């Protein structure tokens, strides 16, 4: 996007001042849409010395004469040319600026416009920058951040020591990664994305995006009327153990609720019987095991079962011991079908196996699993989209790194999912999503498409829960999936 | 307003390109508000070589990539610097321009954006300018005019040979006189007035304005609870004749429906009895006349009656013969109360009498009466606000020149009224308005204020008529006045 600004100015010839005017008026219009009539409010505009501040000066100047009061506190040491020009206009128009902040100033104002730092943030915020942000955060006023809340690194969403918490953030052209990943997503509050005059071709050329309702609608497969279950694919799910008997059931129904034609589970006896007692629609094949876990002695039966399906999901509830490790790796090495690899199949995965596979794979780790898989800490991997992209590219797979914002990448294209809520923070949620992805692959979507549609619909189903989200469970999540699908069109 | 642009650029330092960008985006936003989503429409943008065209180039460029199709037809010979710059952007952004118009082109487009001429129109439109405008007018497409419909003189509202008929006109800063006076008011269609960044002080300094609901609300007098009829003034209306017995009744009720405390009519016997048979609230004093018209023999009785009132209205239904002329002029010469002079009192008025009066006056001519009064043709005086201003200033009065748009001026301040409809184009309407003005003066508003409030409320009452406007009559108009007042607050 910094390339996008430069190109729009330097190659297309749009004056930088015109972009800056358009930016500031977008903020004014966005506030009006959010606050209603602005004429009864008093505005405190906090401007840095950069272009973010320059945007702020445009906001301030455009409120003059039209609202109850406007004051700018200019907190910088020097001004870029466009900030200087717009400061000059604000003052020519009769605007009041002060350069010294007083704790009590928040008193006489209703709205704070945060134009201190945007994408030009470098390093930790300290000093009077920090103090003013902390005063604004204690103040209880309405906070409107220009571009990105000051203190958020707009490439990562991390807080650089301290950051503004906004009610409303107005950003320009496209959402930035720091509005999408947490903690930044949290501090953004309600995000509006304004068109400020970049050519649409440049806006479209950004290679990381937010998964939207429109994108998922156009990816949903067709349901031709002359169809039968084979039309809609077959999934095998290899899952469960004597310890973890529920996982297979949730994965299997995950596949069925997204429209998959046939679902077969392979689960150790007698735990396989749990699935059909709950949903008799499922086929739950008994696997005779020595001690309640899959082992190499089940390899041959599982490949045989794999022959008559389109996709295999493996891992939920398998347990993690050495016999499971031998099985999972020898199976995936020999299986020539797309695989969705989750949970304990990730915990025991030998990543050399993924490189040698000719058939595709999707991996669905939470950060704990991703951390063990690449031998890093949870904090190194959490929201680390570049690491995710490297991993997907290096191993020829799709990586779905789960969290409140989920990252979906094949190494070239990366998508961010923002649907869902904390009712998904509970055992079982992941098991559902695994089945959904397998299901969509079986119905003919690519591994990346299947993953994109599934993470969106999984989170949207959670939001459709009628009662308090914290009471959501996986079984209720399953029942909500077909409603999410209907609301999607 | 051309001064307003120059000052904003040259003294305040706003780049002319920034004003032009703001203008064009206002047009885009206005269209969206009117058409809903723009993405399904094909736009034909007709651009002249001036700044209006330059505004058009901004519109075109901002629709690129976002709507179904955009084409510009550039109809000029050369381009001003800002039109040239914006033409350059449109083309840099991948925009298509052609310089030759083909009758069939209207075919493949849904919306025409008329950016041919704005306030820079000089002289009659001919040639391919004329033909293209006439083609657009026959086309049945949605027409959006930038600033002023091309072909309207924005200072007068006259059509310069031919002009665009717009569904929507977006103008900048303030409405222009040519949106307000006819035929221009008609060709404007729905007018939106966009803020494009002029300082509010400059926008406020314009000395001709449209009478608005807010202005009338703040002028309505107060009704203190501890009041009595004397609080609310007394009016004498000198009116009627054996030929015209209804006029007094309509004037008298006009005063009473706007809140006046006491109304007295002086009307020749027995025509005076007509008023109280209809509204017994009125006081209708019998004037003994020789042949059914006021004459000098009634001068003394009328001045006596004038002593106990605050304002005198004179003229409706008086008739126009020499004895009425002698009476009206000797009366007004001697009366030391505000006068509202209408109808036949205007037709016989000696304007030397107005100059010598110490007390104020409002005159309420339609253009026929104004024409006879200043010895010009109806076409010279109709909508001639400068002539009206000169007359008011020269004679120390307020002039209310009635028409679909009414002009109200004291020679320094001029206001335009745009409320009302064609149900007021019927005998009796004027008689009502005369009483309303007298009423408001009696209640303590200045002659200019009284006139401003009255023309607005009179037209607004007409619009509240429930059935087809052409069936409106004065008696129904009277009944609607208190509803107009209530809706005003």
């Amino acid at each position: 996007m910094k390339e996008i600004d430069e190109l729009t100015i330097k190659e297309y010839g749009v004056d930088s001042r015109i972009l800056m005017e358009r930016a500031g008026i977008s903020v004014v219009l966005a506030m009006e849409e959010e606050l209603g009539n602005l004429s009864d409010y008093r505005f405190l505009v906090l401007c840095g010395g950069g272009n973010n501040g320059g945007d702020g000066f445009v906001v301030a100047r455009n409120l003059l004469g039209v609202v109850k009061d406007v004051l700018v506190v200019f907190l910088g040491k020097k001004k870029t040319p466009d900030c200087e020009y717009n400061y000059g206009l604000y003052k020519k128009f009769g605007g009041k600026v002060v350069e010294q902040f007083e704790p009590s100033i928040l008193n006489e104002f209703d709205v704070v416009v945060d134009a201190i730092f945007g994408t030009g943030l470098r390093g930790e915020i300290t000093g009077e920058y920090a103090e003013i942000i902390n005063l604004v955060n204690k103040s209880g006023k309405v906070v409107v951040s220009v571009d990105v809340p000051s203190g958020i690194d707009s490439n990562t969403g991390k807080v650089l020591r301290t950051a503004v918490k906004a009610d409303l953030t107005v950003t320009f052209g496209v959402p930035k990664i720091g509005h999408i990943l947490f903690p930044g997503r949290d501090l953004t509050g309600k995000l509006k994305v304004a068109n400020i005059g970049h050519p649409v071709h440049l806006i479209n050329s950004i290679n990381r995006y937010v998964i939207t309702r429109e994108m998922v609608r156009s990816l949903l497969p067709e349901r031709p009327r002359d169809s039968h279950k084979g039309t809609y694919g077959k999934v095998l799910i290899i899952a469960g153990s004597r310890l973890y008997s529920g996982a297979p059931v949730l994965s299997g129904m995950g596949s069925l609720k997204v429209g998959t034609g046939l679902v077969k589970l392979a689960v150790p006896f007698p735990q396989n019987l749990i699935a059909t007692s709950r949903f008799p629609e499922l086929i739950s094949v008994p696997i005779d095991t020595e001690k309640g876990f899959f082992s190499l002695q089940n390899l041959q039966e599982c490949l045989e079962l794999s022959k008559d399906v389109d996709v295999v999901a493996i891992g939920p509830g398998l347990g993690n011991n050495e016999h499971v490790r031998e099985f999972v790796n020898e199976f995936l090495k020999t299986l020539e079908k797309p695989a969705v690899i989750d949970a304990d199949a990730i915990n025991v995965l030998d990543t050399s196996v993924l490189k040698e596979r000719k058939s595709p794979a999707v991996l669905t780790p939470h950060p704990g699993e991703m951390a063990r898989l690449v031998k890093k800490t949870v904090g190194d991997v959490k929201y680390n989209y570049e690491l995710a992209e490297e991993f997907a590219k290096e191993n020829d797979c799709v990586l779905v790194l789960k969290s409140a914002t989920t990252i979906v990448t094949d190494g070239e294209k990366t998508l961010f999912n923002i649907t869902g809520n904390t009712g998904l923070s509970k055992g079982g949620s992941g098991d559902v999503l695994t089945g959904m992805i397998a299901g969509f692959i079986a119905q003919g979507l690519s591994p990346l498409e299947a993953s994109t549609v599934s993470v969106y619909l999984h989170g949207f189903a959670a939001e459709l829960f009628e009662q308090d989200e914290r009471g959501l469970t996986a079984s209720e999540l399953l029942r909500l999936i077909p409603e999410a699908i209907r609301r999607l069109k | 307003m051309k001064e307003i642009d120059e000052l904003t650029i040259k003294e305040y330092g706003v780049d002319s390109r920034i004003l032009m960008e703001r203008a064009g985006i206002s047009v885009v936003l206005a269209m969206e508000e009117e058409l809903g989503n723009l993405s399904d429409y094909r736009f034909l943008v007709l651009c002249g070589g001036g700044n209006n065209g330059g505004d058009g180039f901004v519109v075109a460029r901002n629709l690129l990539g976002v709507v179904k199709d955009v084409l510009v037809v550039f109809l000029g010979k050369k381009k001003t610097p800002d039109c040239e710059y914006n033409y350059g952007l449109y083309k840099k952004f991948g925009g298509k321009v052609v310089e030759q118009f083909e009758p069939s082109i209207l075919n493949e487009f849904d919306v025409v954006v008329d950016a041919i001429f704005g306030t820079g129109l000089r002289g009659e439109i001919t040639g391919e300018y004329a033909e293209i405008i006439n083609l657009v007018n026959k086309s049945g497409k949605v027409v959006v005019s930038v600033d002023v419909p091309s072909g309207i003189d924005s200072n007068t509202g006259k059509v310069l040979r031919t002009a665009v008929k717009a569904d929507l006109t977006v103008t900048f800063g303030v409405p222009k006189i040519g949106h307000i006076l006819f035929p221009g008011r008609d060709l404007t269609g729905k007018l939106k007035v966009a803020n494009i960044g002029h300082p509010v002080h400059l926008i406020n300094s314009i000395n001709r304005y449209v009478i608005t609901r807010e202005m009338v609300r703040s002028l309505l007098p107060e009704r203190p609870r501890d009041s009595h009829k004397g609080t609310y003034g007394k009016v004498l209306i000198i009116a009627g004749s054996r030929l015209y017995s209804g006029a007094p009744v309509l004037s008298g009720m006009g005063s009473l429906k706007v809140g006046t405390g006491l109304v007295k009519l002086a009307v020749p016997f027995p025509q005076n009895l007509i008023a109280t048979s209809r509204f017994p609230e009125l006081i209708s004093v019998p004037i003994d006349t020789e042949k059914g018209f006021f004459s000098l023999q009634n001068l003394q009785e009328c001045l006596e009656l004038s002593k106990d009132v605050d304002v005198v209205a004179i003229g409706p239904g008086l008739g126009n013969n020499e004895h009425v002329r002698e009476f009206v002029n000797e009366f007004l010469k001697t009366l030391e109360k505000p006068a509202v002079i209408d109808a036949d009192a205007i037709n016989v008025l000696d304007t030397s009498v107005l100059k010598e009066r110490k007390s104020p006056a409002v005159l309420t001519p339609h253009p026929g009466e104004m024409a006879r009064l200043v010895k010009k043709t109806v076409g010279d005086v109709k909508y001639n606000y400068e002539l009206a201003e000169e007359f008011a200033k020269e004679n120390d009065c307020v002039l209310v020149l009635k028409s679909a748009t009414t002009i109200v001026t004291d020679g320094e301040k001029t206001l335009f009224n745009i409320t009302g409809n064609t149900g007021l184009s019927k005998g009796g309407s004027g008689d009502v308005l005369t009483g309303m003005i007298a009423g408001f003066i009696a209640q303590g508003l200045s002659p200019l204020e009284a006139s401003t409030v009255s023309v607005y409320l009179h037209g607004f009452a007409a619009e509240l008529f429930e059935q087809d406007e052409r069936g409106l009559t004065a008696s129904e108009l009277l009944r609607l006045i208190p509803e107009a007042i209530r809706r005003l607050k």
Binding site: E33, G36, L38 | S26, L29, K192, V193, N195
Partner: peptide, 7 residues
Amino acid sequence: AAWLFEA
């Protein structure tokens, strides 16, 4: 809300 348009 009247910042942009007077109608």
